[PDB]
Design an enzyme around this catalytic site. Structure first.
Site, PDB file in Angstrom:
ATOM      1  N   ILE B  33       0.649  -1.121   0.060  1.00 30.42           N
ATOM      2  CA  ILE B  33      -0.124  -0.159  -0.021  1.00 30.42           C
ATOM      3  C   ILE B  33       0.812   1.286  -0.080  1.00 30.42           C
ATOM      4  O   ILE B  33       0.334   2.546  -0.191  1.00 30.42           O
ATOM      5  CB  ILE B  33      -0.989   0.202   1.100  1.00 30.42           C
ATOM      6  CG1 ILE B  33      -2.092   0.952   0.990  1.00 30.42           C
ATOM      7  CG2 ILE B  33      -0.133   0.067   2.648  1.00 30.42           C
ATOM      8  CD1 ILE B  33      -3.371   0.780   1.858  1.00 30.42           C
ATOM      9  N   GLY B  94      14.141  -2.701  10.256  1.00 31.49           N
ATOM     10  CA  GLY B  94      12.872  -1.747  10.039  1.00 31.49           C
ATOM     11  C   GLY B  94      11.545  -2.586   9.874  1.00 31.49           C
ATOM     12  O   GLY B  94      10.552  -2.200   9.308  1.00 31.49           O
ATOM     13  N   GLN B  95      11.486  -3.417  10.497  1.00 29.13           N
ATOM     14  CA  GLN B  95      10.237  -4.380  10.290  1.00 29.13           C
ATOM     15  C   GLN B  95       9.102  -3.692  11.288  1.00 29.13           C
ATOM     16  O   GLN B  95       9.281  -3.401  12.347  1.00 29.13           O
ATOM     17  CB  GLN B  95      10.517  -5.851  11.048  1.00 29.13           C
ATOM     18  CG  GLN B  95       9.289  -6.772  10.638  1.00 29.13           C
ATOM     19  CD  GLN B  95       9.458  -8.112  11.133  1.00 29.13           C
ATOM     20  OE1 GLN B  95      10.760  -8.451  11.901  1.00 29.13           O
ATOM     21  NE2 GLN B  95       8.887  -9.256  10.940  1.00 29.13           N
ATOM     22  N   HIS B 101       7.485 -11.659   5.915  1.00 27.68           N
ATOM     23  CA  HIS B 101       7.031 -11.262   4.436  1.00 27.68           C
ATOM     24  C   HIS B 101       8.330 -10.993   3.768  1.00 27.68           C
ATOM     25  O   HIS B 101       9.349 -10.417   4.310  1.00 27.68           O
ATOM     26  CB  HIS B 101       5.972 -10.062   4.768  1.00 27.68           C
ATOM     27  CG  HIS B 101       6.472  -8.751   5.416  1.00 27.68           C
ATOM     28  ND1 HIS B 101       6.402  -8.951   6.732  1.00 27.68           N
ATOM     29  CD2 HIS B 101       7.019  -7.576   4.821  1.00 27.68           C
ATOM     30  CE1 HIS B 101       6.987  -7.755   7.024  1.00 27.68           C
ATOM     31  NE2 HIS B 101       7.343  -6.874   5.791  1.00 27.68           N
ATOM     32  N   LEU B 102       8.243 -11.320   2.370  1.00 24.14           N
ATOM     33  CA  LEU B 102       9.245 -10.971   1.355  1.00 24.14           C
ATOM     34  C   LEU B 102       8.609  -9.838   0.566  1.00 24.14           C
ATOM     35  O   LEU B 102       7.741 -10.046  -0.124  1.00 24.14           O
ATOM     36  CB  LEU B 102       9.232 -12.408   0.389  1.00 24.14           C
ATOM     37  CG  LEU B 102      10.355 -12.212  -0.609  1.00 24.14           C
ATOM     38  CD1 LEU B 102      11.701 -12.268   0.066  1.00 24.14           C
ATOM     39  CD2 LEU B 102      10.220 -13.431  -1.513  1.00 24.14           C
ATOM     40  N   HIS B 103       9.675  -8.799   0.514  1.00 22.85           N
ATOM     41  CA  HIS B 103       9.252  -7.509  -0.017  1.00 22.85           C
ATOM     42  C   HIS B 103       9.955  -7.954  -1.761  1.00 22.85           C
ATOM     43  O   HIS B 103      10.936  -8.649  -1.800  1.00 22.85           O
ATOM     44  CB  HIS B 103       9.869  -6.416   0.031  1.00 22.85           C
ATOM     45  CG  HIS B 103       9.516  -5.968   1.556  1.00 22.85           C
ATOM     46  ND1 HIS B 103       8.455  -4.880   1.549  1.00 22.85           N
ATOM     47  CD2 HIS B 103       9.696  -6.033   2.669  1.00 22.85           C
ATOM     48  CE1 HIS B 103       8.235  -4.436   2.746  1.00 22.85           C
ATOM     49  NE2 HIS B 103       8.940  -5.237   3.557  1.00 22.85           N
TER      50      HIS B 103
END
Ligand SMILES: Nc1ncnc2c1ncn2[C@@H]1O[C@H](COS(=O)(=O)NC(=O)[C@@H](N)Cc2c[nH]c3ccccc23)[C@@H](O)[C@H]1O
Lengths: 114, 115
Positions: B33, B94-95, B101-103
């Site tokens: 998002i 920075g989580q 999750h994999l960006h």
């Protein structure tokens, strides 16, 4: 094998690297051009040139790179966190055509990730 | 609860909307998002694992599957020039959401260092 790249030479022990962990199917070693106080790579011994050509049969192996990465990170005292990175191709900034997982920590990592 | 308590669990259970790219029995891929590149999506496990640092040895296949799905979606989305995959762990990483999750980011030149 190990492939026709500098990472292949490292796997074959033909040139030196600061090795952190090794097993029968992967190798973890400190990056020669570190971008954080701790910056290492985990690479498969199988020569997969890039993540885009990995196959379903490789899923366990790729997951193994991440598990080894997180264990090495804990061993290296990265208790405040870290970032894992896989680069693909030109836009990804992939520097060697042998799949490699970067693990960086020891400082605040910023956003965006490049 | 299947999928966990985070807002990623809500997404998994279709309780809040998302722009889904791919879904199977093990994972879900959807657009971020707050994209940091022209294409920026996430691949997450349906099993709640809070962060990579607590993943179990038995999670190997699932974690690898996230990457295979990431690369397949990247191809299906036409990221032929490449992309960057990122996993953030903890504060220094920075989580912000504690569900693994994999960006996957692409559509522009990514720079070094990666943050
Ligand atoms: N409801 C939502 N739908 C889609 N993406 C979402 C969302 N809520 C949060 N996100 C994204 O999920 C990602 C979470 O990534 S993170 O590693 O945990 N946090 C970060 O990267 C922070 N630096 C930001 C961020 O990129 C968010 O934009």
């Amino acid at each position: 094998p190990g492939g026709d790249t500098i990472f292949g030479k490292i796997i074959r022990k033909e040139i030196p690297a600061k090795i952190i962990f090794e097993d029968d199917r992967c190798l973890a070693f400190h990056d020669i051009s570190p971008q954080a106080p701790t910056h290492f790579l985990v690479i498969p011994k199988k020569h997969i040139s890039q993540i885009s050509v990995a196959e379903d049969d490789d899923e366990s192996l790729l997951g193994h790179l991440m598990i080894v990465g997180k264990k090495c990170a804990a061993d290296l005292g990265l208790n405040k966190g870290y970032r894992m990175v896989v680069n693909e191709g030109s836009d990804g900034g992939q520097s060697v055509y042998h799949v490699h997982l970067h693990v960086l920590g020891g400082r605040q990592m910023h956003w965006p990730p490049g």
